[PDB]
Design an enzyme around this catalytic site. Structure first.
Site, PDB file in Angstrom:
ATOM      1  N   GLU A 206      -5.351  -1.425  -2.253  1.00  0.00           N
ATOM      2  CA  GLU A 206      -4.189  -2.290  -2.341  1.00  0.00           C
ATOM      3  C   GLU A 206      -2.930  -1.502  -2.636  1.00  0.00           C
ATOM      4  OE1 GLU A 206      -5.066  -5.907  -4.223  1.00  0.00           O
ATOM      5  OE2 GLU A 206      -6.245  -4.874  -5.732  1.00  0.00           O
TER       6      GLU A 206
ATOM      7  N   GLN B 286      -8.583  -3.729   3.086  1.00  0.00           N
ATOM      8  CA  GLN B 286      -9.658  -2.798   3.448  1.00  0.00           C
ATOM      9  C   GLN B 286     -10.111  -1.635   2.504  1.00  0.00           C
ATOM     10  OE1 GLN B 286      -7.208  -1.237   2.426  1.00  0.00           O
ATOM     11  NE2 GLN B 286      -5.789  -2.566   3.515  1.00  0.00           N
TER      12      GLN B 286
ATOM     13  N   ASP C 188       1.986   5.918  14.493  1.00  0.00           N
ATOM     14  CA  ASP C 188       2.086   4.466  14.359  1.00  0.00           C
ATOM     15  C   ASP C 188       3.514   4.044  14.024  1.00  0.00           C
ATOM     16  OD1 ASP C 188       1.057   1.905  14.522  1.00  0.00           O
ATOM     17  OD2 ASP C 188      -0.232   2.027  12.742  1.00  0.00           O
TER      18      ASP C 188
END
Ligand SMILES: Cc1ccc(NC(=O)c2cccc(C(F)(F)F)c2C)cc1C(=O)Nc1cnc(Nc2ccc(N3CCN(C)CC3)cc2)nc1
Length: 256
Positions: free
Chosen positions: A28, A25, A134
Site C-alpha cells: 500500500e 497487490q 509506463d
C-alpha cells in the site's frame, strides 16, 4: 552502520502513517509524517507478496535517479514490513488533479507548461540511459505549487499507451516512452479523459497498423496535435528526443 541495514535506513519509529492513498497487490501507499513536522509518502510491502529484494530494487534505482522533476527517495526500512519513503506531492496524480474544480479550470498555457515539465523530467531520464516503461498521467504527481514530477506506482502493458514495437516484440526503449508521452499529451489536453475515446484495444491495434493515429482530441491546439504525431512515428528512431520535446513545448508555452 550494521550490515543488515541500508545506507538510506531510518528507524520505523521516525515515521507515522496517517492516510491510505492506495492499497493493493504488493502493498500500500500512505501519506505520513517523518519526525512529526515533515510530510512523506510511504510504500509498504505486502509480506510474501513479492521478494523484499525485488521490492527494494526500486529504491536502489531511485538512488541513482535524483532530480527535481522526479519523485525524491527519502529513506527505507528493510525489516518487514519493508518500507520505501519519498517526498509527498500534495495534489496527487495528474489524472485526478485535472478533474478537480482547479484542474478543470487550467488554461492551455498551464497545461503546456506542465507538459514541458514532464518532458524535462523525461529528458533527465533519457540522459541517464534509463527507460520508464509506463509514462502516463497516472504516474505523474502534482505539487501544491502545481509543478509536476515523474513517478512509477508499478501498476501486460495495457496497449493504449504502449507503442507497436513494444506490444509486438516486448522491446522497450526511451523511444517507446516518447510514444507513451504523446499519449500522455492527450490526457493533459482533455483534462484526464482516456485516450482513443470509445475504442477497445484491438480496435486501437488495427487502426495503428493501418497507419491511423488517434483522432485530434477536442479543443486540442493543432500545433500540439502535430507534436503528438512526431511521438507516434512508425520507426522508433524517427521519434524525437525529450530535450527536443521539452524545447518545443516551452516555445508553445511562452507564445501563450
Ligand atoms: C511512496 C513511494 C515510494 C516509491 C515511489 N517510487 C517512484 O515513484 C519511482 C519508482 C521507480 C522509478 C522512479 C523514477 F525512475 F522515475 F525515478 C520513481 C520516481 C513512489 C512513491 C509514491 O507513491 N510517492 C508519493 C505518493 N503519493 C504522493 N502524493 C499523493 C498521491 C496521490 C494523492 N491522491 C489524492 C487524494 N486521493 C485520495 C488519492 C490520490 C495525494 C498525494 N506523493 C508521493
Amino acid at each position: 552502520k550494521p550490515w543488515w541495514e541500508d545506507e538510506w535506513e531510518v528507524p520505523r519509529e521516525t515515521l507515522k502513517l496517517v492516510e491510505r492513498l492506495g492499497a493493493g497487490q504488493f502493498g500500500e501507499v500512505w501519506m505520513g509524517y517523518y519526525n512529526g513536522h515533515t510530510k512523506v509518502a510511504v510504500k509498504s510491502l505486502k509480506q510474501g507478496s513479492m521478494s523484499p529484494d525485488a521490492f527494494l530494487a526500486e529504491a536502489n534505482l531511485m538512488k541513482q535517479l535524483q532530480h527535481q522533476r522526479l519523485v525524491r527517495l527519502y529513506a527505507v526500512v528493510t525489516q518487514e514490513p519493508i518500507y520505501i519513503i519519498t517526498e509527498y506531492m500534495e495534489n496527487g496524480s495528474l489524472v485526478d488533479f485535472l478533474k478537480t474544480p482547479s484542474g478543470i479550470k487550467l488554461t492551455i498555457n498551464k497545461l503546456l507548461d506542465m507538459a514541458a515539465q514532464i518532458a524535462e523530467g523525461m529528458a533527465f531520464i533519457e540522459e541517464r540511459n534509463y527507460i520508464h516503461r509506463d509514462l502516463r498521467a497516472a504516474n505523474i504527481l502534482v505539487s501544491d505549487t502545481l509543478s509536476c514530477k515523474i513517478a512509477d506506482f508499478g501498476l501486460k502493458f495495457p496497449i493504449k499507451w504502449t507503442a507497436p514495437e513494444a506490444i509486438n516484440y516486448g522491446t522497450f526503449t526511451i523511444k517507446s516512452d516518447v510514444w507513451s508521452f504523446g499519449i500522455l499529451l492527450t490526457e493533459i489536453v482533455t483534462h484526464g479523459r482516456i485516450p482513443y475515446p470509445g475504442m477497445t484495444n484491438p480496435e486501437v491495434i488495427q487502426n495503428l497498423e493501418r497507419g491511423y493515429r488517434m483522432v485530434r482530441p477536442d479543443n486540442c491546439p493543432e500545433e500540439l496535435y502535430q507534436l503528438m504525431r512526431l511521438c507516434w512515428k512508425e520507426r522508433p528512431e524517427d521519434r524525437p528526443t525529450f530535450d527536443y520535446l521539452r524545447s518545443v513545448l516551452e516555445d508553445f508555452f511562452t507564445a501563450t
